[PDB]
Write a protein that holds these residues in place. Structure first.
Motif, PDB file in Angstrom:
ATOM      1  N   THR B  71       0.807  -1.215   0.000  1.00 12.52           N
ATOM      2  CA  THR B  71       0.000   0.000   0.000  1.00 12.52           C
ATOM      3  C   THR B  71       0.845   1.272   0.000  1.00 12.52           C
ATOM      4  O   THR B  71       0.445   2.266  -0.617  1.00 12.52           O
ATOM      5  CB  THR B  71      -0.910  -0.007   1.225  1.00 12.52           C
ATOM      6  N   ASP B 150      -8.121  -1.776  -1.804  1.00 10.15           N
ATOM      7  CA  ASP B 150      -7.457  -2.572  -0.788  1.00 10.15           C
ATOM      8  C   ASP B 150      -8.381  -3.685  -0.279  1.00 10.15           C
ATOM      9  O   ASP B 150      -9.606  -3.530  -0.233  1.00 10.15           O
ATOM     10  CB  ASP B 150      -6.993  -1.663   0.345  1.00 10.15           C
ATOM     11  N   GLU B 151      -7.764  -4.793   0.147  1.00 13.09           N
ATOM     12  CA  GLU B 151      -8.396  -5.962   0.785  1.00 13.09           C
ATOM     13  C   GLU B 151      -9.530  -6.552  -0.054  1.00 13.09           C
ATOM     14  O   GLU B 151     -10.708  -6.462   0.281  1.00 13.09           O
ATOM     15  CB  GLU B 151      -8.898  -5.666   2.201  1.00 13.09           C
ATOM     16  N   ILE B 182      -4.985  -4.887  -4.191  1.00 11.98           N
ATOM     17  CA  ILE B 182      -3.937  -5.308  -3.271  1.00 11.98           C
ATOM     18  C   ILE B 182      -4.478  -6.506  -2.508  1.00 11.98           C
ATOM     19  O   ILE B 182      -5.621  -6.474  -2.032  1.00 11.98           O
ATOM     20  CB  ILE B 182      -3.559  -4.167  -2.307  1.00 11.98           C
TER      21      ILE B 182
ATOM     22  N   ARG C 193      -0.382  -5.388  11.768  1.00 12.09           N
ATOM     23  CA  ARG C 193      -0.569  -4.043  12.295  1.00 12.09           C
ATOM     24  C   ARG C 193      -0.580  -3.958  13.808  1.00 12.09           C
ATOM     25  O   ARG C 193      -0.490  -2.848  14.340  1.00 12.09           O
ATOM     26  CB  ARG C 193      -1.878  -3.434  11.782  1.00 12.09           C
TER      27      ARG C 193
HETATM   28 MG   LIG Z   1      -2.439  -2.743   2.333  1.00 10.50          MG
END
Ligand SMILES: [Mg+2]
Ligand SMILES: Nc1ncnc2c1ncn2[C@@H]1O[C@H](COP(=O)(O)OP(=O)(O)OP(=O)(O)O)[C@@H](O)[C@H]1O
Ligand SMILES: Nc1ncnc2c1ncn2[C@@H]1O[C@H](COP(=O)(O)OP(=O)(O)OP(=O)(O)O)[C@@H](O)[C@H]1O
Ligand SMILES: Nc1ncnc2c1ncn2[C@@H]1O[C@H](COP(=O)(O)OP(=O)(O)OP(=O)(O)O)[C@@H](O)[C@H]1O
Ligand SMILES: [Mg+2]
Ligand SMILES: [Mg+2]
Lengths: 520, 373, 438, 17, 165, 374
Positions: B71, B150-151, B182, C193
């Motif tokens: 990202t 994304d995702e 992604i 994360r």
């Molecule tokens: Mg990402």
């Protein structure tokens, strides 16, 4: 997987031509007559158990365990739903209670059962005098009951199909209803189908500790069939009589398969429909004055198919015919005498059946059977005098001592005369019936006076009873008066193949010989 | 709007150099140009540049295990392209974007994509109809549009159509849509492609030394030990940038300005934790007898799954051997419940006492390692 | 009476200290110092952190979080540049519930909650994206983090870490959970994360002398100047949530002679070998402070005015209440018929080695006794069936997971409990007591 | 026997009666 | 010739439907063309809900949603299926002389073989307004359903192969 | 805390220590409550009535707000929270609305007040054994409701089971277990003999029999009668309300010669067989009778059976070979639907569910002998 052909749906399929035909009018009238008579008989049968149930609910209302009254109904629930409906009708008319009916389909879980119970009680009070079903909590039912009837209606909860419930759901329902007692007066009528042992076996200690049940017993289904057959389908005032093969087949379905009065009514309704849907020639079959209006109404296809029925053939063979078989209008002029002949023959058939059913069903061993239906099927299937069982009955009746014999003939005499006064006298074309039957009864009464004043004369009295009641007024269906096909319905093969269902037999005959069907 | 601070933030000059390294080492401070991702940056830039100048549209699928800088490189290429488009060195383009984990439902992307177009909010049925009218109808002068997604895999499951729609919009010539997807798993479209390899020992050391710049707060071997013990685990860069901040906090509390190697060893022992043996040493003695008897029942019966009944029988045997009395089964089930809450063992709900099954979650040699040594 | 009021004040004091008093703790210098420095740096320097308290249930994790907040809130820097968001995994069972609680507690523009769950998620991310270092720092405290791992996609957790990974508002996420391997419960995006720092909170009292010392500190009456300092700190934390109730120790002011006699009685009772044996049994069982607080609450509950003093026999009596088996006390309450049925079940189980039984086999084995028992001769099968269902509803018998009289079953008891009930039962007829022996 | 042959023979016996 | 004989039966089937009876065919082979010919040649104007019970993926929710949404325009039916049949019974009590025929090829189909869906189908056939024709087993029909399904059995033994079925 | 024990003991003989322990734990409202109490005992021990009278006397005498529940009513948590907030948040009217457990925590958090009134809250959850079968977050919150609400409350729980059954995978908070031991025979005689004035006044309200009653109906007569009653009935059951309801009716039978042991010991053994039944020849169709006895012969747990074996044994005993019509399988389905049969599984497997006596009665009323084929 599904396709819709919607045609004007918003928020009697036949047209005027079929309904304006006489057969639909007369069929609807005769069917409405038979249906109202069966409903009147069922209400007069239920009124005693209705009074006992209302007395239980009002007595509980005059005064924790919930009071509860099991009602030991028959194997087949749906007949008794009308009975429970009459219970709701009486409880609404007296302002004594309000009823929720918890069907087993509504209670897959305790939540759905509580929702349908509270919803049924609130909408039931709304219909004696639409919030969502999601918010019908028992606390709201309590607040609504405090809001209304504390200023007392019982909250009857019928459970018509007690065996179809899940056991844990039923026990949870009994514990929830028992927890609110005192604040909410609950009566829990039930509809057990088996026996009280099924109730005691599916209910353990903790649920039955808070139950004060009382057992009531509905009358037996064969007793209801015997009462219906003696007072409706064998009533003199109705002109449509079933044949004995059809009668025995329908009673065989009721006694040998399922105790549903409704299935017997539907089989008789299909019989009545196949009789009445052949045309206006079958619309001749009713009461005498409208029948004469029908004869003045008739067209010609009805004349040809009244020529076509099998019983017309001996009537012509025993004979002018040119004016009968092709002139039409002479047969239209001739029809009222023949119709009067058939109605008079069936009235004499009913009175002779009443006499013979008393005189034979009081006897020990009973070769011919006790009830009127069994004698009725036997005398219509075949001639009664030629049966060996009637010979055994005549032997045991000439074997009797004089005192019990005179008492039995006097009971038959008082029974047949009381039947002629109470039941035959109101009907039109009934004065001719008592005018035909009564002198023969007076001759039998003179034979009774001869056997009182005098062994061999008992044989003369039996011979007179045989030759003056059994021989002339109780003939076989082949010896029936002509165009009795208008009044009987003997075609049992098509009704049997259309009502009785054997898919495996049809698949078997379809897999052995297609030639039986396709005719290859 | 978000509420502002009552007090002014502390100025940069009062910070220590090690604190300055701690904030440069934070993972939120993305560099303007990513180290050790030059071939993939050139690949995505050349692909996106050709699709922008050709005004034709298309799709791309980038993939790799989390934290490998997917990202950050995609947002850096799109930010550089918007700066180049602002100076009229490239044809202009609109940039829609969505994220699949920020969507409550896969269908709610239809609510969001339209929110990046007109700004009106509508229901997803009307939004799907307006998006089909926007995309399938040729209306010059249409500009090329780039839809970062994304995702992708949460949108893939159970609804089916959303991923089919996102891969179906570029194929029409009327929609000049360039969607970039992604994802983590490589084989996702079957369950134009590009794969992001995990960062190695050398790229992972180079990243941290690039974040530090010319600063000497980190020793050169400390980053080497971090990279050697992180790249054998995952190749994640966020793990290295978190281990470095923990080592910085350890040196800060050691009052040293250099992160010497034992701080990296202490940070590695804390991040790659294995603190079940400490839990077994702090368990109560009856819990220790239970934990011994479960492994005894596994070795005795052969099967790894042990019933509470045979475990309690071995418990009474070991308690008679050790000379202490054991609690009755109504408290032994509470002990098994405490070990199940601690996830030292796997166990069923306690309503089926004596027949509940007790898997041993901790390794059998860990108990002897905790209680002997 | 004055001695009665001093005992009422002591009992009210000890009950309020053992049950409430959510801020003060004992031990843990390093872990509490780490949490305090982490939250202080998040409130001031704006670093976005994450932390995960771990440990057995009953160890003071919620009390540790309340202590760190009670130390940080009166600073008027943490109290002015930082808003705190408590969250609980038991109450916020779904993502929309946690989102509405976040939207209410942050006092967002759409709070006043209006709009959909998706509009709330978009508004929360837009208020967090709208900030920078100039915005107020949020501190999320997600208690019972493992149930938050059970929500769909873990989607709320993916937001709460990602803002910590981005140049936005300075948030801090203090996950608190009991499972030791919650980091292996996370999805790979959430696990990448997550910042893997993990504060462990094991109890510091595995050796027995510390357990006796903890029970002494929990029972001793503190000096009145310590009560005044505690009252000053509680008034300071109420000048700015659980804080309205709490301990509030300024109501109590013991006389010095009363504190001296009570502390003397407490040390003298804890010097005895019997009280040490009872504490030895509880320390052998469960070392957690909640167990000792439960036992001390049952012990402090007995101080009637007629018997003011703690004594070793009281600790032995409450410890006997703790140590006692509870199923034997239910077996002692049964009538003789159900006890004969349980003995028949024990014989059938001893012969067939825990094979599953049935009402019919047990009724036959019982009938073989009842035909010769000369006291149970007249009992009908329906009474035995009601006794069998009464055994079934007590969960002394469990189904193997069909007619009510033919269902398969398993005994829930060890044989030793039935054998101890055979000695503990009152007024057992001798025929049953002899049939039980063989 | 069929109804038609009976009706036909009866009509002939009828005109012959 | 057999199909013409079964086609000659058709006006009699219309009269039997007026009395509240429902039509059932129980022959060996495929009977789909016969029910389709009765819908084509006779029921070209009455409302008709053909239901393919041989469908692998039908639900009771699909058929009840089909009736409640397309015929009655009531929207999606309530989640309790018996509440949906109660709502259908109420809304058809609201509209006399608006009959809804339904023509179920294979009443024994893959998702209607449970007792619950048969109780739902019996409560639907119980409505005076709506009528049922069906193709064919009686083990799932108890006496309460067989009284609510006021069936008139008809031996329609075609020799047609089971292609679609 | 003394007034509650002084008030309950006259209502409750022989429960001195249990009432004393509850009045120590949650008696005075000024003292803080334990986080949860779990008292337990056998059926009839008196925990429902004890907690109800105890909650009523504390809520009437003092400032506490009481809330009694039956957890069987709570098929979902919304109902439970609604009743709990209707009692613990009085006079909110119909404007009250609870969505989930969190809103319940907020609306109880609004109820906190000053210490000078010493308010308290109490939640009794009778039949607490059903709490483990519902939402699984109800019980852990209810064990720490005092911690979450920050409010002086105690959560009583009532069940017939030990607390060992209540543990889950997530663990539970600490609880104060408390036992209600069932009475022995002497104390059971003292409670059954405690209503002497009631039965004496009841016989006196319903005339030489009245005066000859009042000359001799005293305590020794009732105590010896209850001794003969517990000489025969204590062996079968110790549930006290059942013993009360049976002893009153048995005394109404016992009193007649006075108005002795053998004349009453006759009916007493007849009533023991019909204990717990509380009441104040199954006609069948012919072919249904033949199918039912064919299923009984096929099964004599009773064996499961396929329908083809059932039709084969029926055709083997019919000696007529009727066709397989629809009505036969409809009778099979309605014998299933009446719980005459069952569904042990589901090639389908039926299971017969009747005794031998009904089968022999069916074979007598038909004329087909059964024991020959047995
Ligand atoms: Mg990402
Ligand atoms: N090559 C690199 N150079 C410098 N920093 C990097 C590099 N790779 C990753 N990072 C840092 O690590 C973080 C990785 O974030 P990124 O969004 O790239 O992860 P991702 O691969 O998209 O993860 P996921 O697949 O889980 O979404 C970035 O914020 C960046 O600061
Ligand atoms: N270190 C400690 N200092 C002071 N009190 C403690 C400590 N540890 C435990 N306690 C006591 O233990 C009881 C429960 O502690 P606490 O509420 O902190 O556990 P918890 O962290 O909520 O556990 P869980 O979150 O697993 O339920 C409290 O009454 C508290 O007084
Ligand atoms: N000690 C006692 N003295 C007088 N009456 C008692 C006593 N114990 C129980 N009872 C009587 O028992 C009756 C009901 O008992 P209760 O319903 O409270 O038992 P329970 O434990 O709730 O049963 P379950 O657990 O099955 O619900 C009450 O009417 C009460 O009068
Ligand atoms: Mg906590
Ligand atoms: Mg109770």
């Amino acid at each position: 997987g599904c396709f819709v052909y919607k045609n004007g749906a918003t928020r009697s399929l036949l047209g005027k031509e079929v309904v304006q035909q006489p057969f639909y009018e007369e069929y609807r009238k005769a069917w409405n007559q038979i249906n109202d008579h069966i409903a009147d008989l069922q209400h007069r049968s239920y009124a005693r158990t209705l009074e006992q149930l209302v007395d239980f609910v009002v007595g509980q209302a005059e005064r924790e365990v919930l009071p509860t009254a099991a009602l030991l109904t028959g194997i087949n629930q749906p007949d008794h739903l009308s009975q429970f409906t009459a219970l709701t009708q009486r409880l609404h008319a007296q302002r004594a209670a309000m009823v929720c009916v918890l069907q087993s389909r509504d209670c897959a879980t305790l939540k759905a059962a509580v929702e349908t119970l509270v919803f049924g009680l609130v909408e039931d009070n709304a219909e004696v005098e639409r919030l969502r079903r999601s918010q019908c909590t028992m606390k709201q039912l309590k607040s609504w009951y405090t809001n209304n009837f504390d200023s007392r209606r019982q909250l009857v909860v019928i459970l018509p199909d007690f065996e179809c419930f899940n056991a844990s759901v039923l026990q949870d329902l009994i514990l929830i209803l028992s927890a609110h007692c005192g604040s909410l007066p609950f009566v829990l009528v039930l509809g057990v189908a088996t026996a009280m042992t099924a109730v005691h076996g599916t209910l353990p200690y903790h649920v039955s500790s808070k139950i004060r049940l009382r057992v009531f017993q509905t009358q037996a289904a064969p007793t209801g069939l015997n009462e219906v057959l003696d007072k409706v389908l064998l009533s003199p005032k109705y002109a449509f009589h079933l044949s004995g093969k059809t009668f025995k087949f329908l009673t065989h379905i009721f006694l040998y398969y399922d105790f549903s009065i409704h299935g017997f009514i539907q089989g008789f309704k299909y019989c009545l429909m196949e009789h009445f849907f052949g045309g206006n020639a079958f619309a001749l079959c009713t009461d005498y004055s409208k029948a004469l209006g029908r004869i003045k109404q008739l067209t010609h296809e009805d004349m040809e198919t009244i020529r076509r029925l099998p019983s017309f053939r001996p009537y012509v063979e025993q004979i002018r015919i040119i004016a009968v078989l092709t002139d039409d209008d002479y047969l239209k002029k001739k029809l009222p005498q023949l119709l009067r002949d058939c109605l008079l023959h069936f009235l004499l058939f009913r009175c002779s059946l009443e006499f013979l059913t008393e005189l034979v069903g009081d006897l020990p061993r009973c070769p011919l059977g006790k009830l009127r239906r069994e004698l009725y099927v036997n005398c219509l299937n075949r001639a009664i005098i030629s049966t060996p069982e009637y010979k055994e009955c005549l032997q045991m009746l000439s074997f009797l001592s004089k005192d019990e014999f005179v008492a039995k003939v006097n009971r038959a005499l008082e029974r047949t005369e009381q039947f002629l006064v109470e039941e035959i006298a109101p009907l039109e074309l009934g004065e001719a019936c008592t005018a035909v039957l009564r002198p023969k009864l007076e001759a039998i009464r003179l034979a009774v006076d001869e056997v009182v004043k005098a062994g061999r004369a008992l044989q003369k009295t039996l011979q007179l009873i045989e030759t003056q009641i059994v021989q002339d007024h109780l003939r076989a269906l082949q010896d029936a008066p002509p165009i009795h096909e208008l009044f009987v319905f003997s075609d049992i093969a098509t009704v049997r193949r259309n009502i009785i269902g054997a898919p495996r037999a049809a698949l078997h005959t379809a897999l052995n010989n297609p030639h039986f069907y396709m005719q290859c | 709007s978000m509420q502002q601070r009552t007090d002014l933030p502390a100025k940069d000059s009062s910070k220590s150099e090690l604190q300055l390294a701690r904030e440069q080492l934070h993972v939120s401070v993305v560099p303007k140009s990513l180290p050790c991702r030059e071939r993939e940056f050139e690949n995505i830039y050349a692909f996106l540049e050709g699709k922008i100048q050709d005004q034709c549209g298309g799709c791309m699928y980038v993939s790799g295990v989390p934290g490998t800088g997917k990202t950050a490189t995609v947002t850096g290429v799109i930010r550089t392209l918007q700066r180049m488009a602002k100076q009229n060195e490239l044809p202009a383009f609109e940039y829609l974007e969505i994220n699949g984990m920020r969507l409550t439902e896969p269908r709610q992307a239809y609510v969001q994509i339209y929110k990046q177009l007109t700004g009106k909010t509508v229901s997803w049925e009307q939004a799907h109809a307006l998006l089909e009218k926007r995309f399938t109808t040729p209306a010059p002068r249409r500009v090329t549009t780039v839809l970062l997604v994304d995702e992708l895999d949460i949108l893939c499951n159970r609804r089916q159509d959303v991923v089919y729609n996102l891969l179906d919009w570029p194929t029409k010539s009327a929609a000049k849509l360039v969607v970039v997807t992604i994802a983590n798993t490589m084989d996702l479209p079957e369950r134009t492609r590009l794969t992001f390899q995990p960062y190695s020992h050398k790229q992972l050391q180079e990243i941290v030394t690039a974040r530090l710049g010319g600063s000497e707060t980190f020793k050169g071997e400390a980053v080497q030990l971090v990279a050697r013990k992180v790249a054998a685990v995952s190749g994640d860069a966020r793990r290295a940038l978190d281990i470095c901040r923990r080592a910085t906090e350890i040196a800060d509390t050691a009052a040293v300005k250099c992160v010497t190697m034992l701080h990296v060893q202490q940070a590695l022992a804390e991040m790659i934790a294995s603190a079940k043996v400490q839990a077994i040493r702090n368990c109560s003695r009856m819990e220790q007898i239970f934990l011994q008897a479960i492994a005894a029942e596994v070795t005795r019966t052969g099967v790894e799954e042990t019933t509470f009944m045979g475990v309690y029988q071995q418990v009474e045997t070991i308690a008679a051997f050790m000379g202490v009395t054991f609690p009755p089964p109504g408290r032994a089930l509470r002990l098994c419940s405490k070990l199940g809450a601690e996830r030292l063992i796997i166990s069923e709900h306690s309503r089926n006492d004596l027949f509940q099954k007790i898997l041993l979650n901790v390794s059998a040699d860990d108990i002897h390692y905790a209680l002997r040594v | 009476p004055e001695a009665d009021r001093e005992l009422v004040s002591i009992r009210r004091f000890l009950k309020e200290r053992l049950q409430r008093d959510y801020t003060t703790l004992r031990g843990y210098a390093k872990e509490r110092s780490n949490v305090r420095l982490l939250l202080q740096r998040t409130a001031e320097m704006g670093e976005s952190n994450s932390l995960l308290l771990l440990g057995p249930r009953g160890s003071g994790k919620t009390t540790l979080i309340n202590s760190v907040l009670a130390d940080l809130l009166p600073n008027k820097s943490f109290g002015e540049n930082t808003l705190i968001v408590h969250l609980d995994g038991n109450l916020h069972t779904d993502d929309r519930v946690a989102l509405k609680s976040i939207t209410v507690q942050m006092q967002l523009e759409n709070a006043a909650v209006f709009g959909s769950f998706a509009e709330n998620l978009a508004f929360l991310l837009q208020c967090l994206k709208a900030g920078g270092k100039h915005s107020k720092s949020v501190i999320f405290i997600l208690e019972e983090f493992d149930l938050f791992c059970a929500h769909h996609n873990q989607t709320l957790l993916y937001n709460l870490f990602d803002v910590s990974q981005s140049a936005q508002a300075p948030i801090c996420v203090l996950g608190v959970t009991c499972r030791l391997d919650v980091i292996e419960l996370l999805e790979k995006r959430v696990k990448s994360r997550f910042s893997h720092r993990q504060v462990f909170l094991f109890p510091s009292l595995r050796r027995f002398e510390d357990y006796v010392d903890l029970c002494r500190d929990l029972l001793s009456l503190p000096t009145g100047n310590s009560l005044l300092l505690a009252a000053e700190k509680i008034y300071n934390l109420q000048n700015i949530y659980f804080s309205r109730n709490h301990f509030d120790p300024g109501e109590y002011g013991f006389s010095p002679r009363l504190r001296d006699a009570w502390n003397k009685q407490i040390c003298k009772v804890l010097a005895t070998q019997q009280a040490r044996s009872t504490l030895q049994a509880l320390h052998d069982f469960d070392i957690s402070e909640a167990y000792l607080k439960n036992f001390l609450f049952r012990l402090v509950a007995h101080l009637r005015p007629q018997s003011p003093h703690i004594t070793a026999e009281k600790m032995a009596a409450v410890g006997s209440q703790f140590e006692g088996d509870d199923k034997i006390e239910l077996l002692c309450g049964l009538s003789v018929l159900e006890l004969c049925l349980i003995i028949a079940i024990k014989h059938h189980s001893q012969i067939y080695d825990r094979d599953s039984f049935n009402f019919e086999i047990i009724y036959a084995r019982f009938s073989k006794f009842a035909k010769v028992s000369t006291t149970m001769q007249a009992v009908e099968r329906s009474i035995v069936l009601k006794a069998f269902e009464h055994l079934r509803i007590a969960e002394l018998i469990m189904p193997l997971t069909v007619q009510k009289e033919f269902e398969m079953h398993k005994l829930a008891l060890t044989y030793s409990q039935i054998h101890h009930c055979m000695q503990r039962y009152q007024a057992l007829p001798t025929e049953v007591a002899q049939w039980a022996q063989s | 026997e069929d109804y038609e042959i009976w009706k036909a023979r009866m009509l002939a016996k009828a005109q012959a009666k | 010739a057999i199909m013409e004989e079964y086609r000659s039966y058709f006006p009699k089937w219309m009269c039997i439907l007026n009395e509240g009876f429902n039509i059932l065919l129980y022959g060996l082979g495929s009977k789909h063309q016969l029910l389709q010919s009765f819908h084509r040649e006779v029921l070209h104007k009455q409302t008709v809900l053909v239901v393919n019970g041989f469908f692998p993926s039908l639900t009771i929710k699909d058929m009840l949603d089909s009736i409640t949404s397309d015929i009655l325009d009531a929207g999606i039916s309530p989640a309790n299926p018996h509440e949906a049949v109660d709502m259908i019974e109420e809304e058809f009590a609201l509209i006399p002389e608006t009959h809804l025929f339904l023509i179920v090829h294979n009443l024994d189909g893959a998702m209607l073989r449970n007792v619950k869906a048969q109780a739902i189908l019996s409560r639907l056939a119980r409505i005076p307004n709506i009528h049922l024709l069906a193709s064919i087993t009686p083990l799932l029909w108890d006496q309460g359903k067989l009284c609510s399904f006021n069936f008139s059995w008809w031996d329609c033994t075609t020799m047609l192969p089971y292609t679609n079925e | 805390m003394e007034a509650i024990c002084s008030s309950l003991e006259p209502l409750f003989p022989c429960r001195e220590a249990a009432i004393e322990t509850l009045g120590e734990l949650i008696g005075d409202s000024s003292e803080t409550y334990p986080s949860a109490i779990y008292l337990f005992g056998h059926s009839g021990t008196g925990k429902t009535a004890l907690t109800r009278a105890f909650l009523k006397e504390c809520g009437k005498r003092q400032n506490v707000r009481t809330a009694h529940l039956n957890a069987i009513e709570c098929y979902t948590t919304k109902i439970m929270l609604e009743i709990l907030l209707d009692s613990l948040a009085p006079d909110q009217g119909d404007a009250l609305k609870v969505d989930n457990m969190l809103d319940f925590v907020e609306q109880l958090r609004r109820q906190a007040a000053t210490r000078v009134e010493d308010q308290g809250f109490l939640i009794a959850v009778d039949n607490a054994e059903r709490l483990r079968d519902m939402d699984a977050n109800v019980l852990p919150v209810l064990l720490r409701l005092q911690e979450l609400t920050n409010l002086n409350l105690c959560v009583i729980l009532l069940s017939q089971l030990p607390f060992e059954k209540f543990y889950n995978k997530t663990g539970l908070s600490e609880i104060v277990c408390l036992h209600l031991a069932q009475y022995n025979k002497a104390e059971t005689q003292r409670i059954l003999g405690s209503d002497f004035q009631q039965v004496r006044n009841q016989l006196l309200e319903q005339k030489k029999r009245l005066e000859i009653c009042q000359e001799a109906v005293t305590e020794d007569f009732y105590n010896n009668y209850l001794n003969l009653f517990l000489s025969v009935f204590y062996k079968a059951c110790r549930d006290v309300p059942e013993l009360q309801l049976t002893a009153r009716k048995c005394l109404s039978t016992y009193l007649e010669p006075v108005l002795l042991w053998r004349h009453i010991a006759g009916p007493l053994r007849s009533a023991l067989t019909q204990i717990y039944m509380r009441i104040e020849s199954l006609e069948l169709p012919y072919y249904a009778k033949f199918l039912l006895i064919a299923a009984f012969l096929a099964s004599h747990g009773p064996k499961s059976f396929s329908i083809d074996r059932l039709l084969a044994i029926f055709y083997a005993i019919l000696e007529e070979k009727v066709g397989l019509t629809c009505n036969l399988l409809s009778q099979i389905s309605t014998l299933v639907h009446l719980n005459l049969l069952s569904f042990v599984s589901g090639s389908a497997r039926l299971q017969c569910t009747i005794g031998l006596e009904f089968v022999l009665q069916i074979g007598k009323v038909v004329g087909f002998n059964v024991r020959q084929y047995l």
